[PDB]
Amino acid sequence: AYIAVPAVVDSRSSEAIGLLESFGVDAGSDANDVSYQDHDYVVDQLQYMLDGYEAGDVIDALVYRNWLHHSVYCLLPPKSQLLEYWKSNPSVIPDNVDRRLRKRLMLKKDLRKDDEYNQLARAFKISDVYAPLISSTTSPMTMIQNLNQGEIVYTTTDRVIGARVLLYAPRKYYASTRVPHSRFNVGTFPSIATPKCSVMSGVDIESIPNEFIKLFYQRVKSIHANILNDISPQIVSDMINHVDVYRVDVVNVLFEVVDVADGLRSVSRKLIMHTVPVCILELLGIEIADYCIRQEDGMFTDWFLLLTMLSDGLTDRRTHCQYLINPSSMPPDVILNISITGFINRHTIDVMPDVYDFIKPIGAVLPKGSFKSTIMRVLDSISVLGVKIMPRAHVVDSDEVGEQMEPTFEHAVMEIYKGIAGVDSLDDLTKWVLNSDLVPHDDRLGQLFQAFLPLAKDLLAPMARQFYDNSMSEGRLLTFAHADSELLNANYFGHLLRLKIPYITEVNLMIRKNREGGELFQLVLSYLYKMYATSAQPKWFGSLLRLLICPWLHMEKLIGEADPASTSAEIGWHVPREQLDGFIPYVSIRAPRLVIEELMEKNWGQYHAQVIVTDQLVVGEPRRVSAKAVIKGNHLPVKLISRFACFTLTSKYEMGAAYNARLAFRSD
Amino acid sequence: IQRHITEFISSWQNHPIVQVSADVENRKTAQLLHADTPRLVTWDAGLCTSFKIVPIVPAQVPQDVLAYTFFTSSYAIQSPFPEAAVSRIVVHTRWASNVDFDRDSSVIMAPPTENNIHLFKQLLNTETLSVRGANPLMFRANVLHMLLEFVLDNLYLNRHTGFSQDHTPFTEGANLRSLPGPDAEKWYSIMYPTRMGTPNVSKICNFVASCVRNRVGRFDRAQMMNGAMSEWVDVFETSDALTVSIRGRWMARLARMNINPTEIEWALTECAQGYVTVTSPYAPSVNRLMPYRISNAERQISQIIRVMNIGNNATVIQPVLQDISVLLQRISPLQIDPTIISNTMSTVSESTTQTLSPASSILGKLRPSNSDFSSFRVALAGWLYNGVVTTVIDDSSYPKDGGSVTSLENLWDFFILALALPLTTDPCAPVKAFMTLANMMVGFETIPMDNQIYTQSRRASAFSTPHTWPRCFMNIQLISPIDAPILRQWAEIIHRYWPNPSQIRYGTPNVFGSANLFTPPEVLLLPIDHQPANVTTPTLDFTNELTNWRARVCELMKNLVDNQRYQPGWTQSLVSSMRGTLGKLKLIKSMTPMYLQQLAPVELAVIAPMLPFPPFQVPYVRLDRDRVPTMVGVTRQSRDTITQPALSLSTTNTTVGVPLALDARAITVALLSGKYPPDLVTNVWYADAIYPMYADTEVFSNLQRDVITCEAVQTLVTLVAQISETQYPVDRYLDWIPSLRASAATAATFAEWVNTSMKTAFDLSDMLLEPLLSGDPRMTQLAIQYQQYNGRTFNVIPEMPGSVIADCVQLTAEVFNHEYNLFGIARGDIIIGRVQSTHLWSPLAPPPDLVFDRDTPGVHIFGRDCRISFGMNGAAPMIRDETGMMVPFEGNWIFPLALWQMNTRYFNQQFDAWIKTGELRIRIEMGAYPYMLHYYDPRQYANAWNLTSAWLEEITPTSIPSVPFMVPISSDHDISSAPAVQYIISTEYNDRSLFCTNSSSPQTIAGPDKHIPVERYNILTNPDAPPTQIQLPEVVDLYNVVTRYAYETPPITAVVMGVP
Amino acid sequence: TQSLVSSMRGTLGKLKLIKSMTPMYLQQLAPVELAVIAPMLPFPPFQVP
Amino acid sequence: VLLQRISPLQIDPTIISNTMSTVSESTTQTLSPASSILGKLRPSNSDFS
Amino acid sequence: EADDATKKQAKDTEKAKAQVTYSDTGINNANELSRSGNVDNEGGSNQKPMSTRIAEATSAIVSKHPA
Amino acid sequence: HEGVASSSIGKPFMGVPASIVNDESVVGVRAARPISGMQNMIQHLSKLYKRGFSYR
Amino acid sequence: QEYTQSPEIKVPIPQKDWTGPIGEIRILKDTTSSIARYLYRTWYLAAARMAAQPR
Structure with missing residues (x-):
């Protein structure tokens, strides 16, 4: 048989990953009749072929491929070569060539200038010798059926949909650049050709990690989705009967909001909380039953805060629009009772984003009513490996x-x-900016920003640049602020990324008691902060927080039993002798021994910084002086660590004058 | 400040959910080039139903009067009905369904102990402050959207698996149908209700043992082939006859769509015109379903909506023409012959002493450059859409000064234009070619003209309209040969020789509806002439129209350089070389004119059905100015009051049509230079080229989008006709529910509610019935027309075929008219009054001694004049009648609900004290209301006054909450009665939703009693009734014969091979 | 120098028939609230025929 | 101000924008008539005082 | 068995191609009933096996002793 | 990005192939539409000019 | 000195006036009271008829 899969799949490593249970199939019985196909080169072939065709006809070609039926290529060199190839070693010549051309090309003589060979070479055709010969520009619909017919199809063109390119001759003659079958097989890029085929549906198309596969599935679901065969994980299970970091399995919950406010159940609205990772669900123990998310003080029970905090936000099932709940207990709406009613998808994503490619400071901007105090209290209470991340x-x-x-x-x-002369009071200002519905006047707030921007730029950018350089002198950190252009004009070195809460923030500004200034002052100023911000991607904070939390659960699963004397590691800057053996602790890594023994010998001693040593004690119990350091080279790439291990992201280094030395690896 | 917090969060919920705020036209470009096909075939393994029986209160299992050895629940018998005290039936779309692909359209309705008001504050109650409120004027619109949702969910087809014979002797060895899933243990018990044993004398057993034995499971199958799937079966299983009828209508629609692979082979063969052959098998078939065939009118509707969409832009149609240029490049067999223009014109003879060289002048003034051909194939491709795009030549290719006949380069520019201009599709190309030369010579003569504005020195491109054609061009005799014999000659050249229109006959009538509007079916119209070549090996002859025209132009120019009495200003070597260059340029070789005259319309006709944008033409005219199309118009609605679109269409049109402004040099160089291959064979070359084009499926896949487009627009008009007063004849069923006096914003927003429901269904993510939303959704109609120059208006008003969806919506409306109770609605109204008794009667069916009407004697009726005077010095407080009398607070009154809503707070203080204790009763006429139920054990005291006062306080001028009731619980042994106090009573029987009372018990002694409804289960209880019988307009019957199918839906590629 | 007449009749037809309700409002509703707010003015209405 | 805050009417430029579909380039030259009138009209809530 | 019946001849002839073939045939047998374990002797399907659903049917009514 | 978007459907530029992203531009719904080579280069320029420049 | 400067945009585009993003880039609503609509229109039309020419 045959079945699709919504990811890249290999014959080699996909058995190690176990993709069927990864997408949620109960295939725990070792039926072992699913031969995994190698579908990694097809993406490379595809992206090579987008440079000379439309996407649409290439997809329309690629859908017809019988992946069960076996075929192969053989590249051919151009016409002005193949005679010179057949000249040396005339043993390998097919019998389709010509009697006259074989008589011409059998003998030894160089035959460079003779009108017989010139009229034969001008008379030579490449397609009468080899019958398929797909072409230079072949309208690539037809080549799929050509590969369906024959076990081998000949070409002169590099760009192909198909199994394997093979070379007909040695490489020096060229221009610039069987299988075992079980009863089942999985593999992406399905086919409509097979009478028996199936397509693994169930996954969202918006949440496909790869984009080529996403485009392909969009096309195949937008044309002849009638004749496809969408089957559930349960159907797949009934038909059945070096471990990685930053690829977590991730699901999506199906809860709704009800109440018991009058001694009765009553359903009001239904919600969707996308891409929440399954590890946090199974480590918090969430089931179908009725929950209460806000305890009776007025504050959340904070496991639900964590649950929406690591994930992204809410889609209403009737409007398919955005939804950001009230964090207050005011009676427009609250949420007292929920009941999660199932899971919908089971795909896996990468956790580490594209931009974070070097170890350097990280800045995040938030809206003004973001849960800064509570998220600091939650990160305060993190203990996984005897270490606080x-x-x-x-x-x-x-x-x-x-x-x-x-x-x-x-x-x-x-x-x-x-x-403004008519204002001349702070409370008169707070009454004057708003339309008395807590929506502001456009014009009054605009004039306030006209006055506010010179105070927002003339002093804030120089002194914030001073503060950020002072913080750069002492460790790499996690710097929160508001209104991103503060971090932009003050020349803040480091990866800044623009995140937001899945909640509404202004009512958080209105409920917070004992804050400086008026209760409306905070709301007005928050509006001014979001004015001074740019118009960028709000980017959904869970993309950072899954990186913060999720990998150390897997490291907890893997090093739950090994000793620290073989799993801990440390890397940082080094100094050779004592005045007034010496070391600067930069980054801490915990990894298995089968990773550390290869991370031993890597060229850590490559980079250079200018370190500064002073004399004052730390309040902590070992001897540590608050050292300072500035790098006078490049920055350390995050590729160099691993994809098999995880590290502490931001840290403050510790244990005179300037020394200017280099680093090395600290063994264990 | 807390009030401000609440209203600001309500102003946050003031965000609109659906608003087309962005600009649309590049989405329209993408939509026009390619579209999403709908998801038609959708299957169901579970049993088709939409209702389910729920228990409400659990039955008393421990009691003294009956030992527990009597009940089946102590023996754990998997019984079909819940062995409870009170069982009501509720509504769930697909609670027994192993679906293929969900519609995301489920209708959940919680049992009436709890609330369902969110379904009724769904659409237009964006302004209810409390969570538990609903405006009664939105009730009808909400219920219409909910019925639409109900029918739009279960649009699947019944699929069958798994027949096996039992070994229990419960049946007559009847074959039982299986079904997939996690288990099947409860499913057979719930599925086949008469299977179970009959031990007790319970109400369940007394019902079941009076049934018929043989009507269980399989009784019919259609076996075509040995050892294969039985094609369609008939089973006796529990179901819902409503959704059975809906699935039957949908099955009939798809069966109407179905076709035969022999005629797919026929259609594609004659569409390819024999250049591509295909092969269909000749054998017994298993069974198939190819849903591809629709009617002609639906193609016409889709084409009108599409041309109405692409209005007055040209950037939505530029990529279509670009795509057709690329496709004609891929298929067409001509290329550049790169060296004609220099090999010929190498042999031009002149001295090197002459300052100016005509050879090098045009030979560097035109540039071949290989990119001209994409423009040329676009200019060829505009012939399919003369109606909506009109390709012309810009100003920049013109001599831009008027030029000069004595100027050689301007003469060559005139030559380029005189070759180029006949290929475009504007109707004014003859007067362009005429007035270009009249611009070329100003000063040798003048001609009599129209006015002092469009004189001879007016720009050539200015005319471009029928009326700006001069009478001098109309009549040859106005140009005397003493004035300008060369101009009379040029005018005759045009009138005598200019191309003639023709036709080519593409098409496929059996499978495809002819999508043209203003032409006959399966025809194309050409600007030029076409005679098909009999030969296979082509060659060059000079015997066609373009060639003749080219030659004629050269001759005029030979005459123009011949006229030495006007033109002696050359030193005779340039005269000789001019004449030689003319003659040799006349006799250059080029396969391009015979290509255009023989092969290009043949290729174009082969292409023409394989299009996302089907052809749409307006008939050509050579020179008859009275048959020139001035415009083409589409419409969307009737104007003021008039119903007939033939009356409405003239003054309520929308003009569509753009220019294109191609380049003349590109066209002319492609005309002058064009080669065949040196060894070409036309049938071999076409069997090579055209063969992969017919491996497509989108050319069939657009048909289903046209289906769902016509279905959605008919459902839209018949659904807006329920909410307002329009011009279409409908049979409304939803009168007794109160509704808002609608308006434009109301009908418009409701139209996009049904639009987003329809797009969430069927898997449609791009732009269904959106251009109709720009206009007024009340008076919509669809038509198209065009007009010649002399006021001759022709139109096409296509009929709108009936919609299966709309038919099932009206059917669901009819069934709602009787089973209004099942969706939590009661008819009539309520009576509020202090009732003190020990009786056990249900407030859903009050005894008629209590209710009253307008006709009841001694009852006051309050209308618009409601003044309330206080009673000073111990007098009774009174209220003014509608009839002008004063009445104290006593007796039986009748209110409209809107009066109470408008004055809810003033009336609470004035009226709540008397209704609690004193003799006062109120009728509140409301027509419809949702309700909630609160049961009680009748052995104790009970008062509903807190629930009633909560309703009377929570009620609001813009919303009402669900109406709370209080009804006791039926018993088995006799109990001791206790007094209970009821206030809210109904006026009309509403007990068509409770299923059974004390089902596991043998009898019910007190409270409301109800057997198993025998009138539902007709087939099991009437031996005289045939198996196929529904009393669907009156009741539901919950158990019928249902058919299932086991068709396959293969691809058309895997049916029809066409392997070479 | 180009046939702008098709473009012009398209944009003028789209400009003619439209979901505008301001003339409907000004016809039917607007004099009612003018007659409402007319006597509660510090300066009573004063017009000329 | 009083008529603005007691009239049921509200003014929306997206009516005009949805009818007209502003940026629409025919005659790749001086502007199309639809773009010309939409630039002339500036559909935007400046005020309606 | 179009992929697999040709492989026996390709193993015999000591040639990767095959002369006697069961594909590359101009005869369109698109109907082509080949018997299979998909369908039982009745006409139903076999996603769930026969004895399993007979057992589910006869276990859909059981009875146990009271307390 | 949008001016080329009418004329650009499946055109490739030198070096760069096509791709796909999603949009909230049809804010009632969300879909994913393919991306041409002009729009690909603009999509790559977007993060560079949005981000800021690093100067040794 | 000179590479530490930011412009003084006193009237920025309000955040309500951009659409949902396409990739990384939000699109201007055309019913926008801000000035940048005209800049959007000029570069829009210029990119369109830039890609229209085959040169």
């Missing part, structure tokens, strides 16, 4: 730069009420 000690509050003004910059924006 995100301590409180090197996380940066949004107003750490904002509180160190000797005018205390909030007291410089408390000054703004005298810009």
Whole structure:
């Protein structure tokens, strides 16, 4: 038989991954009649072939391929070559050539200038000798049926949909650049040709990790989806009867909001919380039953905060639109009871994004009512391996730069009420900007931004650049702030990324008591912060938080039993002798021994920084001086560590004058 | 400040869910080039039903009067009905369904102990503050959308697996159908209700033992082939006759669509015109389903909507022409012969003493450049769509100064234009060719003209319209040969020789509807002439039209350089070389004119059905100015009051049509230089080229989008006709539910509610019935027309075929009219009044001693004048009648609900005290309402006053909550009665939703009693009734014969091979 | 120099028939609330025929 | 201000934008008439005082 | 068995191609009933086996002793 | 990105192939539409000019 | 000195006036009161008839 799969698949490593249970098939019985196909080169062939054709006709070709039926290519060199190839070693010549041309090309003589050979070579054709000969430009619909007919199809063109390109001759003559079958097989790029074929549906098409496979499935579901065969994981299970980091399995929940507010169940609305990782679900123990998410003080029970915090947000099932809940207990709506009613998809994604490619500081901008205090308290309570991955000690509050003004910059924006003569009071300003429905006037808020931007640029960017350079002098950290162009004009080195909560934030501004200034002052200023921001991607904070939390669960699964004396590791800057053996702890890695014994001998001693040593004690119990260091070279790539191990992202280094030495590896 | 918090969060929920805010035309380009096909074939392994029986309160299993050895529940008998005290039936689309592909369209309805108001505040209650409110004027629109959702969910086809004979003697060895899933243990018990044993004297057993034995499971099969799937079976299983009829209508629609591979072979063969052969088998078939055939009218509707979509842009049609240029490049057998223009014109003879060289002048003034051919194939491709695009030549290819006849380069520019201009599709190309030369010579003569504005020095491109054609061009005799004999000559050249129109006959009538509008079926129209070549090996002759025209132009120019009495200003070597260059340029070789005259319309006709954008032509005219199309118009609606679109169409049109402005040099160089292959054979070359083009399926896949387009627009018009007053004859069934006085915003928003429901169904993600939403959705109609120059207007108003979806919506409306109880609605209204008794009667069916009407004597009726005067010094507070009388607070009154809503707070304080204790009763006329049920054990005291007062307080001018009731629980042994106090009573019988009372018990002694409804299970209880019988308009019957199928849906590629 | 007449009649027909309801409102509803707010003015209405 | 805050009417430029589909390049020259009138008209909530 | 019946001849002839073939045939046998374990002797399917669904049928009504 | 989007459907530029992304541009729904080589180069330029420049 | 400067955009485009993004880039609504609509229109039409020429 045959069945599709919505990922890249190999004959080699896909058996190690176990893709069927990864997509959720109960195939725990070792039926072992599913020969995994190698469908990795087809993507490379595809992206090579997008440069000379439309996507559409190449997909329309590629759908007809009987992947069960076996075929192969043989590349042919051009016409002005093949005679010179058959000249040397005339043994391998097919009998389809010509009697006259074989008599011409059998003998030894160089035959460079003779009108017989010139009229024969001009008379030579490449397609009468070899019958398929797909072509230079072949309208590639037909080549799929050509590969379906024969076990071998001949070409002169590099670009092909198909199994394997093979060379007819040695490489020096060229231009620039069988299988075992079980009863079942999986493999992406399905076929409609087979009478018996199936397509593994169930997965969302919006959530496919690869994009070539995503485009292919969009086309195949947009044309002749009638004749396809979409089957569930249960149908697949009934037909049946070096471990990686940053590829977590991830699912999607199906809850809704109800109440018991009058002694009765009552369903109001239905929700979808996308791409929540299954490891957190199975480690928190979430089942179908009725839950209560906000405890009676007024604050969340915080496991649900964690549950929506590691994931992204909410789609309403009746409108398919965005939805961001109220975090207050006000009676427009709240959420007291939920009941998760199932899971829908079981795909796996990469966790590490594209941009984070070097070890350097990380900045994140948030809206003003983001849950900064509670997320700092949650990262404060992280203990997985006897190590805190995100301590409180090197996380940066949004107003750490904002509180160190000797005018205390909030007291410089408390000054703004005298810009307009009719205002001349802070509470009159807060009454005056809003339309008395807590939606602001456009014009009053616009004039306030006209006054607000010179205070927002003239001092904030220089002194915030000073603060960010001072923080750069002491470790790489996680710097939160608001209104991203603060991080942009102050020349903040480091990966900044623009995230948001899956909640609404303004009612969080309105409920927070004992905050400086008026209760409306906070809301107005929050509007001004989102004015000063750009128009970028809000990018859904879970993309960072899954990187923060999710891999160390797998490292907990893998090194639950080995000793620290073989699993711990440390890397950092080194100094050779004592004045007034020496080391700077840069990054901490915990990995299995079968990774550390190869990470031993890698050229760590390559890079250079300018280290600074002073004399004061740390409040911590070992001897540690708050050292300083500035790198005078490049930055360390994250490829060099592994994809098989995980590291602490941000850290503060510790244990005179400037020394300017290099690093090495610290063994274990 | 908390009030401001609440209203600001409501202003956050003031966001619109559906709003086309972005600009659309590049989505329209993508939509026009390619579209999403709908998901028709969708299957069902589970049993088709839409209702289910739910228990409400659990039956008393421990009691003293009956030992527990009597009940089947102590023996754990898998019984079909819930052995509870009170069982009601509720509504669930597909609770027994191993589906193939969900519609995401399920209708959930919770049992009436709890609430269902979110379904009724679904659409237009975006302004209800509380979570439990609903505007009664939105009730009809919400119920219409819910019925639409109900029928739009279960649009599947019944699929069958797994027949096996039991070994229990419960039946007569009847074959039982299996079904997939995790288990099948409860499923046979719930599926075949008469299978079970008959031990007790319970109501369940007393029902079941009075049934018929043989009507279980399989009784018919259609076996075509030995050792294969039985093709369609007939089973006796539990179901829902409503959804059985809906699936039957959908099955009939698909069976109407179905076709035969022999005639697919026929259709594709004659569509390829014999250049590609295909092969269909000749053997017994298993069974197939190819849904591809539709009617002609649906093709016409889809084409009108599509041409109405691409209006006045040209950037939506430029990539279509580009695609056809690439396709004609791929198929067409001509290329550049790169060296004609220099090999010929190498042998031109002149001295090197002459300053100006005509050879090098045109030989560097035109550039072949290989990119001209894409423009040429576009200019060839515009002939399919003369109606919507009109290719012309821009100003920049013109001599841009008026030129000069004495100027050699301007003369050559005129030559380029005189070759190029006959190929385009504008109707004014003859006067372009005329007034170009009249611009070329100004000053040798003048001609009599129209006015002082469009004089002879007016720009050539200015005319471009029928009326700007001069009378001098109309009549030859106005140009005397003493004035300009060369101009009279040029005018005759045009009138005598200019091309003639023709036709080629593409098409496929049996399978495809002829998508043209203004032409006869299966025809094309050409600007030029076509005679088909008999030979296979082609060669060159000078005996066709383009060649003749080219030659004629050269001759005029030989005459023009001959006229030395006007043109002596050359030193005679340039005269001789001019005449030689003319004659040799006349006799250059080029296969391009015979290509256009023989092969290109043949290829074009072979291509023409394989298009996402089907051809759409407006008839050509050579020179008859009274048959020139001034416009073409589409429409969307009737205008003011008039129903007839033949009356509405004239003043309510929408003009469509763009220019294109191609280049003349590109066209002319492609005319001048064009070769065949040196060894070409036309049938071998076409069997090579055209063969992979017919490996497509999208050319069939667009037909189903045309299906669902026509179905959606007919469902739209018959659904808007229920909410407002329109011009289409419908039979409304939803009168008694109150509804808003609608308006434009109301009908418009409801139209996009049904649009997004339809797009969520059927897997459609791009732009269904959206151009109709730009207009007014009330008075919609579809037509198209065009007009010649003399006021001659021709139109096409195609009929709208009936919709299976709309038919099933009306059927569901009819069934809702009787089973209004099953969706949680009661008819009539309520009565509020202090009732003190020990009786056990249900408030869903009050005794008629209590209710009253307008006709009841001594009952007051309050309309618009409701003033309320206080009673000073101990007088009774009173209210003014509608009839003008004053009445104290006593007796039986009748209110409309809107009065209470508008004055809810003032009336609560004035009226709640008397209704609690004193003698006062109120009728509140509302027609429809959702309800909730609160049971009670009748052995104890009970008062509903908190629930009633909660309703009377929560009620609101813009919303109402669900109406709470209080009804006791039926018993088995006799109990001791206790007094209970009821206030909210109904006025009409509403007990057509409770299934059975005390089902596991042998009898019910108190409370409401109800047997198993025998009138539902007709087939099991009437021996005289045939198996195929429905009383579907009145009741539901919940158990019938249902058919299932086991068709296969292979690809048309895997049916029809065509292997060479 | 180009036949703009097809483009012009298209845009003018789209400009003619439209979902505009301002003239409907100004016809039917607007004088009612003008007559409502007319007497509660510090300056009563004063017009000329 | 009072008529603006007691009228049931509200003004929407997206009506005009959805009818007209502003950026639409025919006659790759001086502007199309639809783009010309939409630039002339500027459909945008400036005010309606 | 178009892929597999040709392989016996390709193994015999000591040639990767084959002369006697059961594909590359101009005869369109698109109907082509080949018997299989997909269908039972009745006409139903076999996603769930016969004895299993007979057991499910006869276990869909059982009875146990009371307390 | 959008001006070429009418004329660009499946055109490849030198070096760069095609791709696909999604959109919230049809905010009631969400789909994914293929991306041509002009739009591919603009999609790659987008993060570079959106990000900022690093200067040794 | 000079590479530490940011412009003074006193009236930026409000965040309500961009569409949902396509890849990384949000698109301007055309019913936008901001000035940048005209810039959008010019570069839009210029890119269109730039890619229209086969040169």
